[PDB]
Structures are given as structure tokens and as C-alpha cells.
Design a protein around this ligand. Structure first.
Ligand SMILES: CCN(CC)CCNC(=O)c1c(C)[nH]c(/C=C2\C(=O)Nc3ccc(F)cc32)c1C
Ligand SMILES: [Cl-]
Length: 302
């Protein structure tokens, strides 16, 4: 299941069972104060809908479809539990409330009015200018910085995203980016950026080699995916390894050290970050804390 995980020291780390996390009923919000509007996204067993919450503000509500298995209802509760455990950060999509009694489970989160960053980059591409409502290099550096800060936050809570990519970054007012976990509000069997692997469907072009070939997911594999995200960002939304099918040839190239070339709009210091994120040795990749400091220096030099 493609979703984030909280880990605990064991093994090195093992996933926690999120059903065992506590749920504080302080999050409880009266269901009668929600007015539901348009659907923003929909998986096979769930969906996220724009809503108005009186006591008015626009929010996003995650909920199950009526055909949901009993393990899906628990899964949505576990989503709520993980969000409550993580706490609040500017660069994640934050929990605002929940409805857990008197009806089906509703998870109320922040609404990001511009949608996912990938599609935003793609429709802004032909107006982009490196320097001077155009998208500029200043914005891209800001987005890189914010996603690094959000990931540093998740890592500090022992959380591994496992699917970091521009499609999972949302954009809201003030050019603020927020990391998201679609969970039951997305069906990946649709999306060609996921690839069949055994029983699983996986975002192979974003994954570290040790995740693909050894099923190892760590703080360090998230850094690999962040490097792929940077490439998406400074390519203005191009698909990674463009024109290369995922087959045995692709896997061999990754294993033997093949990497993407620099996007034409990436500053050399940002391509330097990408390259270190894609070190075959996870111990040689930077931490998100290091990445934050490096990008802070570039913005200062800007
Ligand atoms: C296909 C691109 N289209 C624009 C050109 C669609 C635009 N994209 C949109 O409208 C959109 C908006 C405005 N919000 C979301 C998603 C979420 C949001 O806001 N909070 C969440 C919390 C959890 C979650 F799992 C998803 C969301 C979308 C897809
Ligand atoms: Cl910021």
C-alpha cells in the first residue's frame, strides 16, 4: 500500500501499526457544520471533497465510498491517527478536525486552492522566465526549500513518506507548498507513473534502488525521491527519465549508476543537490536538514 509510515527503532527501524496510535477526541468537529461541495479527487474506496466548515472556512474532507471494506474504515481512522501524531507544520497538509461518531468517518484537512504542484508547473511552463504573474527561478527555489522543510519535519517525527513526487505536493495562497498523502483518496491503478511490480504497483521512477531491489524504505530513500522531485521542479513538470520505459534495461541502468542529466533551468548548485540525493550509497546522501541549510544559502546568495 503506497502511503506514509511512522517508524520506531527495533531491525534498525520497523513500521509502527498505526491502529495503535491514540486518537484525541479534541479533534472532533460537529458533522452538521460541514457543507460539501465539489469533489477534488477520488480513489476506489474513498474521495476528498471541498467543503465549508462553519466555525466559515473552506476545507478538504476525506471520506470513504459506500463500497468500502471494513479494513478501509480502519485505514481511514489510521490516517487520522497518523496526522494527529505528526502535529502541525506549514509545509504539510494539516489536520483540522474529524467526525468519528454519529456517522461515517470524516477527516478534515487544509484546502490548497491551486491543486497539485505537478499540474501547476506544467500549465505555467510556457510563461516561465528565470528572472524578471510569471513563474520564476525565485519561485522554484522557494518550492524546493519548502518541500525540504516539510520533509525535514516528517523525518524528525520518524515518518517516511514513501511516495514523494510533485503530484503529491499541493500549492495554496502565498506560494506555500504542502506535502500530502492521498491515501484512500487516490487509485494508482489509473496512473502510468506507477508500475506493476509483483502484486504491488509502485512509483518506480521515483524510488531509490534499495527500495526497488531490496524493499528497503528509509529516511534516506525519501531523500532519493526528493532529488527526483527537484528534477521535476526545474524541468517545469517533465516526466522523469523521459522516453525510457520501465523494463529490465531501465533497472540495470539505475543499478549501474545511470542518472538523469541536469534540467536546463536548474542552477548548478541545485543539480549538485540532485546528484548527491541519487548516490547509490544511502549513507552518502544528504539529510533533509542538510538540504534545508544548502538551499537557505542559495536563497541568501540570491
Ligand atoms: C487536474 C488539475 N486541475 C487543475 C488544473 C485540478 C485542480 N486541482 C484541485 O482542484 C485540487 C484542490 C484545489 N485541492 C486538491 C486536493 C486536496 C486539497 O486541497 N487538500 C487535500 C487533503 C488531502 C488529500 F488527499 C487531497 C487534498 C485538488 C486535487
Ligand atoms: Cl517559506
Amino acid at each position: 500500500e503506497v502511503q506514509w509510515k511512522v517508524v520506531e527503532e527495533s531491525n534498525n527501524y520497523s513500521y509502527i501499526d498505526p491502529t495503535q496510535l491514540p486518537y484525541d477526541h479534541k479533534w472532533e468537529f460537529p458533522r452538521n457544520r460541514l457543507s460539501f461541495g465539489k469533489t477534488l479527487g477520488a480513489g476506489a474506496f474513498g474521495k476528498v471533497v471541498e467543503a465549508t466548515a462553519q466555525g466559515a472556512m473552506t476545507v478538504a474532507v476525506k471520506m470513504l465510498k459506500p463500497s468500502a471494506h471494513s479494513t478501509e474504515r480502519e485505514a481511514l481512522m489510521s490516517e487520522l491517527k497518523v496526522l494527529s501524531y505528526l502535529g502541525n507544520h506549514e509545509n504539510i497538509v494539516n489536520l483540522l478536525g474529524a467526525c468519528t461518531h454519529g456517522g461515517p468517518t470524516l477527516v478534515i484537512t487544509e484546502y490548497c486552492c491551486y491543486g497539485d504542484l505537478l499540474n501547476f508547473l506544467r500549465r505555467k511552463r510556457d510563461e516561465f522566465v528565470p528572472y524578471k504573474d510569471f513563474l520564476t527561478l525565485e519561485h522554484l527555489l522557494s518550492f524546493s526549500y519548502q518541500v525540504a522543510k516539510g520533509m525535514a519535519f516528517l523525518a524528525s517525527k520518524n515518518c517516511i513518506h514513501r511516495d514523494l513526487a510533485a503530484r503529491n505536493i499541493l500549492l495554496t495562497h502565498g506560494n506555500i507548498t504542502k506535502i500530502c498523502d492521498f491515501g484512500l483518496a487516490r487509485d494508482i491503478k489509473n496512473d502510468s507513473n506507477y508500475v506493476d511490480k509483483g502484486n504491488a504497483r509502485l512509483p518506480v521512477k521515483w524510488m531509490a534502488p534499495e527500495s526497488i531491489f531490496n524493499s528497503v524504505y528509509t529516511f534516506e530513500s525519501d531523500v532519493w525521491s526528493y532529488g527526483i522531485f527537484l528534477w521535476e521542479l526545474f524541468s517545469l513538470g517533465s516526466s522523469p527519465y523521459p522516453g525510457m520505459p520501465v523494463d529490465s534495461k531501465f533497472y540495470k541502468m539505475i543499478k549501474e549508476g545511470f542518472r538523469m542529466s541536469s534540467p536546463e533551468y536548474a542552477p548548478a548548485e541545485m543539480y549538485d543537490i540532485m546528484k548527491t540525493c541519487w548516490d547509490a550509497d544511502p549513507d552518502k546522501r544528504p539529510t533533509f536538514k542538510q538540504i534545508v541549510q544548502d538551499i537557505e544559502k542559495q536563497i541568501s546568495e540570491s
